[PDB]
Amino acid sequence: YSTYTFLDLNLDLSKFRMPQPSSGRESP
Amino acid sequence: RFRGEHALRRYPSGEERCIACKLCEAVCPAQAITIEAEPRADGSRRTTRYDIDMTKCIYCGFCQEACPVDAIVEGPNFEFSTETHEELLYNKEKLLNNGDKWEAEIAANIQADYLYR
Amino acid sequence: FGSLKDEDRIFTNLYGRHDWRLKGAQSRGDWYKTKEILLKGPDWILGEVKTSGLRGRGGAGFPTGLKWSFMNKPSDGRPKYLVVNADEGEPGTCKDREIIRHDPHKLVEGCLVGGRAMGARAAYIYIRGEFYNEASNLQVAIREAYEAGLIGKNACGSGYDFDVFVVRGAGAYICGEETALIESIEGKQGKPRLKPPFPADVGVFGCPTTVANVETVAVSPTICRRGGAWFASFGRERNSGTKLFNISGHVNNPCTVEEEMSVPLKELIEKHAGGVTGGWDNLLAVIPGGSSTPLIPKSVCETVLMDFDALIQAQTGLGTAAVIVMDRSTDIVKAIARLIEFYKHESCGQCTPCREGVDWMNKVMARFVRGDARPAEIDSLWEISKQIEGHTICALGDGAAWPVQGLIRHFRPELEERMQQFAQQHQ
Amino acid sequence: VHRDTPENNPETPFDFTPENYKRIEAIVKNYPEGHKAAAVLPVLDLAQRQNGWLPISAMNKVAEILQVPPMRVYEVATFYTMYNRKPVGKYHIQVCTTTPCMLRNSDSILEAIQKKLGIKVGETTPDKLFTLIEVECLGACVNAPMVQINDNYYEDLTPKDIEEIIDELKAGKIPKPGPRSGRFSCEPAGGLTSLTEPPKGPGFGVQ
Amino acid sequence: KVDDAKVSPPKRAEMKTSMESLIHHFKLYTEGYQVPPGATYTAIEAPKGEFGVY
Amino acid sequence: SNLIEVFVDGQSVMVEPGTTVLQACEKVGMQIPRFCYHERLSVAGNCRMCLVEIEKAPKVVAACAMPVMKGWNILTNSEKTKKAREGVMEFLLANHPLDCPICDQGGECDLQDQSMMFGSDRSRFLEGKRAVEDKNIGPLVKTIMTRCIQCTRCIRFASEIAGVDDLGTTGRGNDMQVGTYIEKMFMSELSGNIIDICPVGALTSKPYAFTARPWETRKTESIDVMDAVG
Amino acid sequence: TRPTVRPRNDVAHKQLSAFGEYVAEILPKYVQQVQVSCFNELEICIHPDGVIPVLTFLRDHSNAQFKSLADLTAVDIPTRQNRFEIVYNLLSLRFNSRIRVKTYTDEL
Ligand SMILES: Cc1cc2nc3c(=O)[nH]c(=O)nc-3n(C[C@H](O)[C@H](O)[C@H](O)COP(=O)(O)O)c2cc1C
Ligand code: SF4
Ligand code: SF4
Ligand code: SF4
Ligand code: SF4
Ligand code: SF4
Ligand code: FES
Ligand code: FES
16 A cells, blocks of 8 residues: 555664664674 | 489588588598588688598498588599599589589489488 | 364354454454463473374475474574465465455464474564565554564563564565575575475574474464364364365355365365356366366265375375366366466476476477377377476476376376367368 | 667666665664675665666666675576566556466456557557556465556456456546455355354463 | 487488487497497308308 | 495495585496586586486485485486486487587587487477577687576586676576676686586687587697796 | 397307306316306307317317317407417307307417
8 A cells, every 4th residue: 555665664663673683693 | 322423512502511510521431531621701610621532432422421411422423534643632622513513413313312211 | 084074163273354453452362371381391382283283284294293393403503583484376375365464463473472482583474575565564563563562572571582574575486495485585596405405494594494384383373372182173183173275266256264174075165155157067177286286077076075185095185275176168178278388487497307398398288279280199298297206306396297197197088089179170 | 578688778877765775774684694695685676666667777786785796686687577677667467367367267357458458468558657468376366357557456357347447547546456346355255254252261271 | 220229320301300310310420339348250151151250 | 433334236335424426426436427516616406417216215316416324225227217317318408409510519518428328319399499599708708508408517617716706597487598697798817718617519619619520639738838837 | 128129049048058067177177267158159268278188179079079160360458468369269060059269378
């Protein structure tokens, strides 16, 4: 229904609330 | 199916049917044939030197039967016998004529014979 | 199998559909008891599904119960993830996307409750982007709950909680295999790897992953919520459970229904709701699998129950869980070519048997249908199909021949007479 | 179609709106670090969106962002389907034709478009706004020969009302991306009722 | 001809269209057959007497 | 002390824990036919011309990439293997147009010294044969891509040793080409060395282009001095 | 297999196993190897000492006639460390068979 605008979907609640990430390294 | 003096055909408007795939050279028992290709100007390949020695050739019928593009063909003319061994060695541009002197002979034999083999 | 059913009550494994789409407390069914589950030792969940022993909905055997208590028992240096197909590859499947469309609140739980068994770290899902509208909403469904503090990083009551990162594809078949999806989750071109590296639980993103399916991780929480002793309800001592079938291609009202195992196809097709074509005299030429099983004629199929191993009794079984049939006007030879013309477009193209080996058929199948040069071909075309089996990496080849392999079986003459129909015509 | 470019827009040029550089912060945040190196699937497609089909300078651009040699992009855009390398119309429409969609005669919702819309298959309308294709394996075969427009889908269609769905779209009207007739959700009808209930008085496997 | 075609050349209808009919006509006019090792002898009745090949 | 014994064709042989079938079955003197495998490069699986047949198991494995466990009986020659290696190399002669008179590799090629010895006899197709189109790279590599058995031995080499990453795989289904999507010419040192790699005559050398076929020559070893390493 | 492949015959291969079994039996001072060519012919590997001796036994007997000498020949092999080779070849008119007698040598 919103053709563009994945933004807040991706960047609003997800951006702050996707902790940590640690995710490590893999420098390589 | 007779065997004899050699030729090199060409299609309708002429291509010098030989592609220089270096075969009629490599099945030759006697090793008469000698071939040197080198890429022609457009980029389609053809020959430069092609020499059948006419003393060594043992008349197999191995060089009529290995050519996939179906160029080189043993003619049915026993015209021969010149007086100097400096001669019978052939170049390319002796052959073609000797094979364009009669193509009414040749082009009407194969279409009798080619249905068997 | 008991009474030869497979009934449907309001007691089923799926909570609701037309009731409440949006968020909340999971007003009745869902998100009920959590902190008690997770706080007990993880392997309590492992093997506690064995009371059911779900075969899995991924189109195959290999019960889901084993592979999770399978390797990924230990852990060393590197995180573990979850990749759960949402994709549909098979024509007429349609089972998926109905789970997500009106009730997303289930699966975000299905991972969190599920992922604890893996001991995993993060949660990826995957969806064909060809669904733009419905798939777009999960993020809300994620947010509308996750925002409340239901997930992550401790939520709830444990020291272990982690969120779910949606992704998308484009022209994928990629769910056509694991060890492809975990490759195009990465961003390479998707050519599925060799199957035994290190099979799919060693070689992975950077590090071991497990590829689940939708209702394999969807129904797990509710089967660990209650379980039993009802976990095994219908179906014989081998296959047990109640899965979803979605009927398509001739019926009165083709639509999904929850139906347990061992249901015969002659009552099931007719029911839910009608048989609207001829319940008989429409010849009922049937396809058990979506694309993965060849025809059955009017023979024992109609009495043949839909239990898995019951189908291996016939010349082909089906794990796909879909139904497509025919009646009269549809010319099978005409109607199976556009099942093959499909395969030619969805194949990776690495392997020499698959590529250049499917077209050899697809190029000839437009001879038979049109009607065209003589038999004794059929005898060869069978051998081609017999010649691609151990020769391809993925299953798409092993799923390439069966439709043609099982067309030459079960219908001899329909071809033989048509090659005449054009033979007499030529005359 | 051919997969080589005859030097169309090597420098088109092209660039992302500064509103979009704040999302690409979020995308890469998904993945772990050092392997990041391909977010390409959303990031390359977001670029299609800002534009509406991506020229060859779009394929070269993201490489400067993602530091991968840009034959590790031109590849990925020639594998999948959804991306459109050549230009397109305002509406890029699909007719599902496959075994199930054939059985319900998708040809119905297909041609009778040429007599209405007046163009061939695989050809954009002479101006812009319309083109025509067909594809396989999307959504449901439980519905009629369903049809896709661009971001939506019209389930359970018939030659009668699709005359409208195009023609009301030529007017600029957008007619409800759902299975307009029959059952709205694709309901069983035959046990649809069920009377939803709470889960049978839980406390079950508490043990 | 012997049928198996590794030891016989093909016709001029066959070597001239399908594929397999060069690589066995174009490796058959450079090297020969591959004939396993080991010795034979043989003999016939030729008009004036026997004829050997060892 | 860290080795396995595995019976190749009913003969015991020792192998370090983690050599593949192919590196074992070489130790006793056999070549499983090879297309995508090559020593100095990496390994992938997309030829399917080495199918060894393992003992007592219905599937047929592949002897390029897969370890060898406590002793199998690695059975090379039976009526099962010979059912495959004959059935692949009739596939990759489906499209391989009717060159060999003039394909300049016509004396070494490996659609030739396999498919007499191993594999098929005659053909059943009978009509078909895509022909794609070539392009150019530089004034060395001459490119007719009509052939390409598509081992992908030229590609894993660019990203590998000579570090220039250009060549790619563009397409899906029966049609994928190889050469570069844009018009970029591909030129470096050691990258004139490809034309040992490609097992059939796709990539053939420019200056040499048409001069002699390789049963006539005379190999007299030598040493190159323009520079240090010789 | 039948149509193009040369049909074999067993009987000829059973006897020429026997009759050649025991000419390693009764002249072991000389004969050092014997075998059966898959086409039903024999090869007797004999030391260079017996040449006049062995034939003379093959010259007459009631169990082996071998009166007709057909083909003497040679082969010369480097990397056999004793270069040349002889091969005698003898037909026994009564019993219809060929038995060849191989004897090595050098130049000196
Ligand atoms: C052409 C093709 C399409 C497939 N499509 C799907 C799919 O859409 N969803 C899915 O879960 N598995 C699909 N699979 C099969 C995968 O193997 C399966 O998902 C995977 O084995 C997970 O099985 P499990 O989770 O039930 O154990 C497909 C396989 C093929 C060959
Ligand atoms: S004729 Fe046949 S053989 Fe003689 S040169 Fe031309 S091609 Fe080679
Ligand atoms: S004619 Fe007889 S001899 Fe002269 S070349 Fe042809 S084959 Fe060799
Ligand atoms: S079949 Fe061969 S090619 Fe088609 S996908 Fe599976 S592996 Fe890749
Ligand atoms: S290239 Fe390889 S295959 Fe193609 S013709 Fe020359 S040899 Fe035969
Ligand atoms: S060059 Fe010929 S063989 Fe080497 S990879 Fe490209 S196509 Fe496959
Ligand atoms: S495949 Fe045509 S709609 Fe599902
Ligand atoms: S040789 Fe078998 S994988 Fe390439």
